[PDB]
Scaffold this active site. Sequence first.
Site, mmCIF file in Angstrom:
data_model
loop_
_atom_site.group_PDB
_atom_site.id
_atom_site.type_symbol
_atom_site.label_atom_id
_atom_site.label_comp_id
_atom_site.label_asym_id
_atom_site.label_seq_id
_atom_site.Cartn_x
_atom_site.Cartn_y
_atom_site.Cartn_z
ATOM 1 N N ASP A 10 28.421 -0.646 39.323
ATOM 2 C CA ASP A 10 26.605 -1.603 38.476
ATOM 3 C C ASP A 10 26.594 -2.239 39.902
ATOM 4 O OD1 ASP A 10 24.525 -1.924 36.202
ATOM 5 O OD2 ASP A 10 25.241 -3.790 37.614
ATOM 6 N N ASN A 123 33.370 -2.737 35.760
ATOM 7 C CA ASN A 123 33.502 -3.978 33.890
ATOM 8 C C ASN A 123 32.320 -3.155 33.610
ATOM 9 O OD1 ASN A 123 34.979 -6.047 35.661
ATOM 10 N ND2 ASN A 123 33.792 -7.818 35.843
ATOM 11 N N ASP A 334 23.404 41.164 41.286
ATOM 12 C CA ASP A 334 23.287 43.396 41.976
ATOM 13 C C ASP A 334 23.636 43.861 40.455
ATOM 14 O OD1 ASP A 334 26.486 45.120 42.000
ATOM 15 O OD2 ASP A 334 24.461 44.774 43.712
ATOM 16 N N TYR A 465 29.298 52.767 38.658
ATOM 17 C CA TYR A 465 29.088 53.851 39.702
ATOM 18 C C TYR A 465 28.436 55.139 39.864
ATOM 19 C CZ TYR A 465 28.331 50.054 43.380
ATOM 20 O OH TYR A 465 27.887 48.914 44.218
ATOM 21 N N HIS A 523 22.956 39.409 51.031
ATOM 22 C CA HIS A 523 23.861 40.061 49.670
ATOM 23 C C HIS A 523 23.657 39.156 48.913
ATOM 24 C CE1 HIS A 523 24.006 42.839 45.993
ATOM 25 N NE2 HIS A 523 25.497 43.120 46.024
HETATM 26 N N1 LIG Z 1 24.105 44.833 50.995
HETATM 27 C C1 LIG Z 1 24.676 44.984 50.027
HETATM 28 N N2 LIG Z 1 23.847 45.386 49.007
HETATM 29 C C2 LIG Z 1 24.166 46.550 48.375
HETATM 30 C C3 LIG Z 1 25.745 45.652 48.712
HETATM 31 C C4 LIG Z 1 26.549 46.546 47.696
HETATM 32 C C5 LIG Z 1 27.871 46.637 47.958
HETATM 33 C C6 LIG Z 1 29.579 45.702 47.192
HETATM 34 C C7 LIG Z 1 30.639 45.953 47.874
HETATM 35 C C8 LIG Z 1 30.812 47.520 48.758
HETATM 36 BR BR1 LIG Z 1 32.343 48.132 49.214
HETATM 37 C C9 LIG Z 1 29.638 48.261 49.134
HETATM 38 C C10 LIG Z 1 28.022 47.675 48.874
HETATM 39 S S1 LIG Z 1 25.952 45.325 49.641
HETATM 40 MG MG LIG Z 2 28.393 -4.511 40.272
#
Ligand SMILES: Nc1ncc(Cc2ccc(Br)cc2)s1
Ligand SMILES: [Mg+2]
Lengths: 546, 546
Positions: A10, A123, A334, A465, A523
Amino acid sequence: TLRAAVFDLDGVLALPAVFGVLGRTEEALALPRGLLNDAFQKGGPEGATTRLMKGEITLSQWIPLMEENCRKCSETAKVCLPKNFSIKEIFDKAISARKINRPMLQAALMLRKKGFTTAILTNTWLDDRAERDGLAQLMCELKMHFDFLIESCQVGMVKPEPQIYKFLLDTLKASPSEVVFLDDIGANLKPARDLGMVTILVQDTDTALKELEKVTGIQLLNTPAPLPTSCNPSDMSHGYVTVKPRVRLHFVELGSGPAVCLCHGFPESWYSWRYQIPALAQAGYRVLAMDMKGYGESSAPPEIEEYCMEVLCKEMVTFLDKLGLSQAVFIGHDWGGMLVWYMALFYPERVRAVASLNTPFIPANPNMSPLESIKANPVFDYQLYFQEPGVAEAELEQNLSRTFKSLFRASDESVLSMHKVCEAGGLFVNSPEEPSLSRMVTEEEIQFYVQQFKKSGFRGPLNWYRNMERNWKWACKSLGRKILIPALMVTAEKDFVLVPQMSQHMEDWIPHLKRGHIEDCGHWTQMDKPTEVNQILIKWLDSDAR
Amino acid sequence: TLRAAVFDLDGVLALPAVFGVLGRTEEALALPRGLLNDAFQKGGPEGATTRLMKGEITLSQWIPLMEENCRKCSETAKVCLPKNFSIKEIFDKAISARKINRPMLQAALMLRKKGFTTAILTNTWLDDRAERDGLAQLMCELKMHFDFLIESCQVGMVKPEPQIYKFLLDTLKASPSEVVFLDDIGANLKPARDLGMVTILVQDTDTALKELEKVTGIQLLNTPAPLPTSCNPSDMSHGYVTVKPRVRLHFVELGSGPAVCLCHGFPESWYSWRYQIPALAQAGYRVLAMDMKGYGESSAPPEIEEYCMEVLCKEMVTFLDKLGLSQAVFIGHDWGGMLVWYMALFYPERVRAVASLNTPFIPANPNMSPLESIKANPVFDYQLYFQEPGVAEAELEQNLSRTFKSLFRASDESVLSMHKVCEAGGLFVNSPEEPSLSRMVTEEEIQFYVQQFKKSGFRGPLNWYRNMERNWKWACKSLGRKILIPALMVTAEKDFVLVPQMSQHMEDWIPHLKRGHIEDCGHWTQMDKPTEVNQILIKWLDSDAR
Ligand SMILES: Nc1ncc(Cc2ccc(Br)cc2)s1
Ligand SMILES: [Mg+2]
Ligand SMILES: Nc1ncc(Cc2ccc(Br)cc2)s1
Ligand SMILES: [Mg+2]
């Protein structure tokens, strides 16, 4: 010399002091000056207020004793209290008006970071009011930033009794002269001073901080703006859900209120949200930060098709089923960003709102194989390198520390281009063996990622990917739909792969889309511009998801 | 012969059918009979409704196509639609009116329990309406009870196309003649019948169930009332929080809404709440069912004082801190019940409401050592036996299966008295080697407890009883307080240790106390009378904690 810092609550860590409200209430209601402070303090060490502060009675039991004391002070002063004089009402209002005094908190934080032990000595009372949650939140927010919180009502002792100071020195394992103590009440400093503590009588905050900076020799006032609070992995609640027999998902969980599920990208971790998690929890959300499938403590089966978007989405749905959540807000970055858009497309009923950092929503082209589409953009060449099983794994696992230190860099710190990676034969071919530490990350943080990726390496992550054709086919089923739930797209100015202009046609598919944009942000958006991310998300959550 | 059972959703598992709402709406608004069902079905396999049901468009995109179809049916019928005719409004109301048809669900459940594979096959849509959560909850509630849920909008196919039936037979790994399928629409049964499935045209529920009972040979109608849904441990989200460096707490987590923390007694487990967890989640709460310290997957340090009430309470507070919860509802049974009362006494600000099963709140007697107090009641003699470290451990770990089978029994099934245990020299001295299985528990459930207690045995659990003096001293600090937050006491008629009359003076200390009482209920309240427990808790939560 000084090794400990102790802050009153306080009038020091929280403002306006509630004592100051007795002042105003007297004037507002035109009573005798000090009548309310006399009734408050009636009977000294044996009066109602001391029993409250020591924890002998609760706040609800004290309210009517304070009423009696007000009747008695008023009679002896020959005035009458207003009709509708209410002690509960006055203290309800006073307690809800007090907030965290931000600059004192940041001074305490900073001293903790230069190695001080820090505590709050206050307190206070056992609060059983209908409205007690207000105070419980405040105390939770302050307390995570200190080594100790000592409460008079918990220890059975009060300022300014000399016994609580001995209990203080003892809790801090320090001697009277290694301690500074700030309090707004001279009487409380009096005994700390007797044992030989540095004390600071706290009136306006800046003068106190100037005295504190002088006595500790550490700069506290006019400091640059601090980062948001981060997370210590071993202080978090860790969740595990088996979504099918070979596959469990791990997540870190903080906060209460509407479920917000955060979905990181490649090659990252729940920890990539470390700066968002405390802020969203503090803003009134239940945060669930995933290890996405392939990562960290979630399972990472080897097969490529365990990682197509369809299986991944179905499994995030099961994750909600087993947790008993009919919906969550989905926020992705991402690859996570891609996944949340498809959550919005295929499971709108399970998605309260959807947001993406960097990753735009761009509908599949049904007349072009997605591989040709990826070849059409030279900045996506790293995705081709990722295609052949093993090749990228060998490079990225070869040196983990080098891998993450090379990747996790601000936009002016680059040590690799995403440019003709295939031809060069590697992502890191012309990059340093031992990169310098980016300003975005500490050595400790890199080592957290390194330790995560020792569990399963890069197979499962790269497999995200390796389903271009399968993802394309699935996505084509959605080409008649629109996203019509609440949606936010946040672009990052200096993301040179996921560039802001790639998002430019999103309103065709998501006509009510909201946008944020972050300037000077590469990124790694969450750790590049955490403060700005926190502000854009929290504002969009409060208006669209609440 | 029949190995699979398939249930339609609209008009079979959920009622009123939404088709029936087109009927009523027409009459309510005095339109041509069937005008709304014609517009709905306009264009057949290529019309708006089929594209919706296959998942080509979302429900929000279909709404205005159905509007157009209504304009067109009305023009060709030479009527006008009312001013303020709203397709969104009609379907919002119709979807929110439909509920789970309880007796069909229990028939599906029962067939699943006699070994059938079960599924829901439904023509449904991608629901992106502002109000979509209503439907998402319903589907979550049904779906946890079936092997499959097949949705037309997810698979890209509809009833009555013959392709969805083949996708059905294939998902079920069964042949056409091993399947029964119930649907309220004759046209949908038509193709199932062609492949040779048993079909049941579903009009009133009872006639359908009579046909189902006839064809499967299993009794489904007029069955006794089923137990509430239980939990399968490996289907739950498992949480871990380190509260100090040697001590982590495990919990099982289900639901969203206000935090409800369930605290089991001796010698039990999170699993003792298996019948409460799904019901409280379904009632709108976030359930956190603990392994209390000493048990299951929580840590179990050996020292006696790690288990005094003070340390236990402080640690439950830290548990809330790390999880980011400013409050929870605390519900306890036996030792857990004791702990939640002291949570209410010492941390009212962290406790939203408090409830106890069986364990009364009785203030410490400051003028009698708690050991003498325990000697004054012959039914507490088992607590003296517990005092000497090792002795009770050796007996209770010697045969786990025997231990839990002897303990976990209904009030007429007893095989031990709590009576002169010390003199007899054991809790089990004159009880069977291989007890019979109580009607309360299956062999599988006992074996879950046995497997839990293999991790740490009975040391940590018995230590809860080995802090009489220390607990007494702590409790005496609270002897001026009252419990003035919302509180519920539930007594169990045939608990012969924690008898209902021991609770009789509780209102002196908790003047606003609420009560439930359960007749014919022994000590193991949650698994003895789960249905009644669920009803008393949910009702008290909805009125006092929400
Ligand atoms: N500027 C960026 N955009 C996307 C990215 C993605 C990426 C992450 C890890 C590896 Br390894 C390669 C690419 S890095
Ligand atoms: Mg006080
Ligand atoms: N009716 C009952 N009230 C309390 C009980 C507690 C108890 C549990 C386990 C052992 Br071993 C002994 C007693 S049993
Ligand atoms: Mg139907």
